[PDB]
Coordinates of all heavy atoms in Angstrom, one line a residue:
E40 N 0.8 -1.2 0.0 CA 0.0 0.0 0.0 C 0.8 1.3 0.0 O 0.3 2.4 0.2 CB -1.0 0.0 1.2 CG -2.1 -1.0 1.1 CD -3.1 -0.7 0.0 OE1 -3.0 0.3 -0.6 OE2 -3.8 -1.7 -0.3
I41 N 2.1 1.2 -0.3 CA 2.9 2.4 -0.4 C 3.7 2.3 -1.7 O 4.4 1.3 -2.0 CB 3.9 2.6 0.8 CG1 3.1 2.8 2.1 CG2 4.8 3.8 0.5 CD1 4.0 2.8 3.3
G42 N 3.6 3.3 -2.5 CA 4.3 3.4 -3.8 C 5.1 4.6 -3.9 O 5.2 5.5 -3.0
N43 N 5.8 4.7 -5.0 CA 6.7 5.9 -5.3 C 6.1 6.7 -6.4 O 6.0 6.3 -7.6 CB 8.1 5.4 -5.7 CG 9.0 6.5 -6.2 OD1 8.6 7.7 -6.1 ND2 10.1 6.2 -6.8
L44 N 5.5 7.9 -6.1 CA 5.0 8.8 -7.1 C 6.0 9.9 -7.3 O 6.0 10.9 -6.5 CB 3.6 9.3 -6.6 CG 2.9 10.2 -7.6 CD1 2.3 9.3 -8.8 CD2 1.7 10.9 -6.9
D45 N 6.8 9.8 -8.4 CA 7.7 10.8 -8.8 C 8.6 11.2 -7.6 O 8.8 12.4 -7.4 CB 7.0 12.1 -9.4 CG 7.9 13.1 -10.0 OD1 9.0 12.7 -10.5 OD2 7.6 14.3 -10.0
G46 N 9.1 10.3 -6.8 CA 10.0 10.6 -5.7 C 9.3 10.7 -4.4 O 10.0 10.9 -3.4
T47 N 8.0 10.6 -4.3 CA 7.2 10.7 -3.1 C 6.6 9.4 -2.6 O 5.7 8.9 -3.4 CB 6.2 11.8 -3.2 OG1 6.8 13.1 -3.6 CG2 5.4 12.0 -1.9
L48 N 6.9 8.9 -1.5 CA 6.2 7.8 -0.9 C 4.7 8.1 -0.7 O 4.4 9.1 -0.1 CB 6.9 7.4 0.4 CG 8.3 6.8 0.3 CD1 9.0 6.6 1.6 CD2 8.3 5.5 -0.5
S49 N 3.9 7.3 -1.3 CA 2.5 7.6 -1.4 C 1.6 6.5 -1.0 O 1.7 5.4 -1.5 CB 2.2 8.1 -2.8 OG 2.9 9.2 -3.1
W50 N 0.6 6.7 -0.1 CA -0.4 5.7 0.3 C -1.2 5.4 -0.9 O -1.6 6.2 -1.7 CB -1.2 6.2 1.4 CG -0.6 6.4 2.7 CD1 -0.3 7.6 3.3 CD2 -0.1 5.4 3.6 NE1 0.3 7.4 4.6 CE2 0.4 6.0 4.8 CE3 -0.1 4.0 3.6 CZ2 0.9 5.3 5.9 CZ3 0.4 3.3 4.7 CH2 0.9 4.0 5.8
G51 N -1.6 4.1 -1.0 CA -2.6 3.6 -2.0 C -1.9 3.2 -3.3 O -2.6 2.6 -4.2
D52 N -0.7 3.6 -3.5 CA 0.1 3.0 -4.6 C 0.9 1.8 -4.1 O 0.6 1.4 -2.9 CB 1.1 4.1 -5.1 CG 0.4 5.2 -5.8 OD1 -0.6 5.0 -6.6 OD2 0.9 6.4 -5.6
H53 N 1.7 1.2 -4.9 CA 2.3 -0.1 -4.5 C 3.8 -0.2 -4.9 O 4.2 0.5 -5.8 CB 1.5 -1.2 -5.2 CG 0.0 -1.0 -5.2 ND1 -0.8 -1.2 -4.1 CD2 -0.8 -0.5 -6.2 CE1 -2.0 -0.9 -4.4 NE2 -2.0 -0.5 -5.7
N54 N 4.5 -1.1 -4.2 CA 5.8 -1.5 -4.6 C 6.9 -0.4 -4.7 O 7.7 -0.4 -5.6 CB 5.8 -2.2 -6.0 CG 4.9 -3.4 -6.0 OD1 4.9 -4.1 -5.0 ND2 4.2 -3.6 -7.1
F55 N 6.8 0.5 -3.7 CA 7.9 1.6 -3.6 C 9.3 1.0 -3.6 O 10.2 1.7 -4.1 CB 7.7 2.4 -2.3 CG 8.1 1.7 -1.1 CD1 9.5 1.9 -0.6 CD2 7.3 0.8 -0.4 CE1 9.9 1.2 0.5 CE2 7.8 0.2 0.7 CZ 9.1 0.4 1.2
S56 N 9.5 -0.2 -3.1 CA 10.8 -0.7 -2.9 C 11.6 -0.9 -4.2 O 12.8 -1.0 -4.2 CB 10.8 -2.0 -2.0 OG 10.3 -3.0 -2.8
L57 N 10.8 -1.0 -5.3 CA 11.4 -1.3 -6.6 C 12.1 -0.1 -7.2 O 12.9 -0.3 -8.1 CB 10.4 -1.9 -7.6 CG 9.7 -3.1 -7.2 CD1 8.7 -3.6 -8.3 CD2 10.7 -4.2 -6.9
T58 N 11.8 1.1 -6.7 CA 12.4 2.3 -7.3 C 12.9 3.3 -6.2 O 13.0 4.5 -6.4 CB 11.4 3.0 -8.2 OG1 10.2 3.4 -7.4 CG2 11.0 2.2 -9.4
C59 N 13.1 2.7 -5.0 CA 13.7 3.5 -3.9 C 14.9 2.8 -3.3 O 14.9 1.6 -3.2 CB 12.6 3.8 -2.8 SG 11.1 4.7 -3.4
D60 N 15.8 3.6 -2.8 CA 17.1 3.1 -2.2 C 17.1 3.6 -0.8 O 16.3 4.4 -0.4 CB 18.3 3.6 -2.9 CG 18.4 3.1 -4.3 OD1 17.9 2.0 -4.6 OD2 19.0 3.8 -5.2
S61 N 18.1 3.1 0.0 CA 18.3 3.5 1.4 C 17.1 3.5 2.2 O 16.8 4.5 2.9 CB 19.0 4.9 1.3 OG 20.1 4.9 0.6
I62 N 16.3 2.4 2.1 CA 15.1 2.3 2.8 C 15.3 2.0 4.3 O 16.1 1.1 4.6 CB 14.3 1.2 2.2 CG1 14.0 1.5 0.7 CG2 13.0 0.9 2.9 CD1 13.5 0.3 -0.1
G63 N 14.6 2.7 5.1 CA 14.7 2.5 6.6 C 13.5 3.0 7.3 O 12.6 3.7 6.8
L64 N 13.4 2.5 8.6 CA 12.4 3.0 9.6 C 13.1 4.0 10.5 O 14.2 3.8 11.0 CB 11.9 1.8 10.3 CG 10.9 2.1 11.5 CD1 9.6 2.6 10.9 CD2 10.8 0.9 12.4
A65 N 12.4 5.1 10.7 CA 13.0 6.1 11.7 C 11.9 6.8 12.4 O 10.7 6.6 12.1 CB 13.8 7.1 10.9
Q66 N 12.3 7.6 13.4 CA 11.3 8.5 14.0 C 11.8 9.9 13.5 O 12.9 10.2 13.6 CB 11.4 8.4 15.6 CG 10.7 7.2 16.2 CD 11.3 6.8 17.5 OE1 12.4 6.3 17.6 NE2 10.5 7.0 18.5
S67 N 10.8 10.6 12.9 CA 11.1 11.9 12.2 C 11.8 12.8 13.2 O 11.5 12.8 14.4 CB 9.9 12.5 11.7 OG 10.2 13.4 10.6
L68 N 12.8 13.6 12.8 CA 13.6 14.4 13.7 C 12.8 15.3 14.6 O 13.1 15.3 15.8 CB 14.6 15.2 12.9 CG 15.4 16.1 13.8 CD1 16.3 15.2 14.7 CD2 16.3 17.0 13.0
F69 N 11.9 16.2 14.0 CA 11.3 17.2 14.9 C 10.0 16.6 15.6 O 9.8 17.0 16.7 CB 10.9 18.4 14.0 CG 12.1 19.1 13.4 CD1 12.3 19.1 12.1 CD2 13.1 19.7 14.2 CE1 13.4 19.7 11.5 CE2 14.2 20.3 13.7 CZ 14.4 20.3 12.3
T70 N 9.3 15.8 14.9 CA 8.0 15.3 15.3 C 8.0 14.0 16.0 O 7.0 13.7 16.7 CB 7.0 15.3 14.1 OG1 7.6 14.4 13.1 CG2 6.8 16.7 13.5
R71 N 9.0 13.2 15.8 CA 9.2 11.9 16.4 C 8.1 11.0 15.9 O 7.6 10.0 16.5 CB 9.2 11.9 17.9 CG 10.0 13.0 18.5 CD 11.4 13.0 17.9 NE 12.2 11.9 18.3 CZ 13.3 11.5 17.6 NH1 13.7 12.2 16.6 NH2 13.9 10.4 18.0
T72 N 7.5 11.2 14.7 CA 6.6 10.4 14.0 C 7.3 9.1 13.5 O 8.4 9.3 13.0 CB 5.8 11.1 12.9 OG1 6.7 11.6 11.9 CG2 5.0 12.2 13.5
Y73 N 6.6 8.0 13.5 CA 7.2 6.8 12.9 C 7.1 6.9 11.3 O 6.0 7.0 10.8 CB 6.5 5.6 13.3 CG 7.0 5.1 14.7 CD1 6.5 5.6 15.8 CD2 8.2 4.3 14.8 CE1 7.0 5.2 17.1 CE2 8.7 3.9 16.0 CZ 8.1 4.4 17.1 OH 8.6 4.0 18.3
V74 N 8.3 6.9 10.7 CA 8.3 7.1 9.2 C 9.0 5.9 8.5 O 10.0 5.4 9.0 CB 8.9 8.4 8.8 CG1 8.0 9.6 9.3 CG2 10.3 8.6 9.4
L75 N 8.5 5.6 7.4 CA 9.3 4.9 6.3 C 10.0 6.0 5.6 O 9.4 6.9 5.1 CB 8.4 4.1 5.4 CG 9.0 3.5 4.1 CD1 10.0 2.3 4.5 CD2 7.9 3.0 3.2
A76 N 11.4 5.9 5.5 CA 12.2 6.9 4.9 C 13.0 6.2 3.8 O 13.5 5.1 4.0 CB 13.1 7.6 5.9
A77 N 13.2 6.9 2.7 CA 14.0 6.4 1.6 C 14.5 7.5 0.7 O 14.2 8.7 0.9 CB 13.2 5.4 0.8
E78 N 15.3 7.1 -0.3 CA 15.7 8.0 -1.4 C 15.0 7.4 -2.6 O 15.3 6.4 -3.1 CB 17.2 8.0 -1.6 CG 17.9 8.5 -0.4 CD 18.0 10.0 -0.4 OE1 17.7 10.7 -1.4 OE2 18.5 10.6 0.6
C79 N 14.0 8.1 -3.1 CA 13.2 7.6 -4.2 C 13.5 8.2 -5.6 O 13.8 9.4 -5.7 CB 11.7 7.7 -3.9 SG 11.1 6.5 -2.6
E80 N 13.4 7.3 -6.6 CA 13.7 7.8 -8.0 C 12.5 8.6 -8.5 O 11.3 8.3 -8.3 CB 13.9 6.5 -8.8 CG 14.3 6.9 -10.3 CD 14.4 5.6 -11.2 OE1 13.7 4.6 -10.9 OE2 15.1 5.7 -12.2
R81 N 12.9 9.7 -9.1 CA 11.8 10.6 -9.7 C 11.5 10.0 -11.1 O 12.2 9.2 -11.7 CB 12.2 12.0 -9.7 CG 12.5 12.6 -8.3 CD 12.4 14.1 -8.3 NE 11.1 14.5 -8.7 CZ 10.8 15.8 -8.9 NH1 11.7 16.8 -8.7 NH2 9.6 16.1 -9.4

């Protein structure tokens, strides 16, 4: 349920991992929200 839309991780799309690198789980720096983080291909 997460895809890559022109470089943006997006709900409702699929298979982000096929076009994104450096995939990881983190807590966002300022907000401490749980995030999937990556470098995605545009």
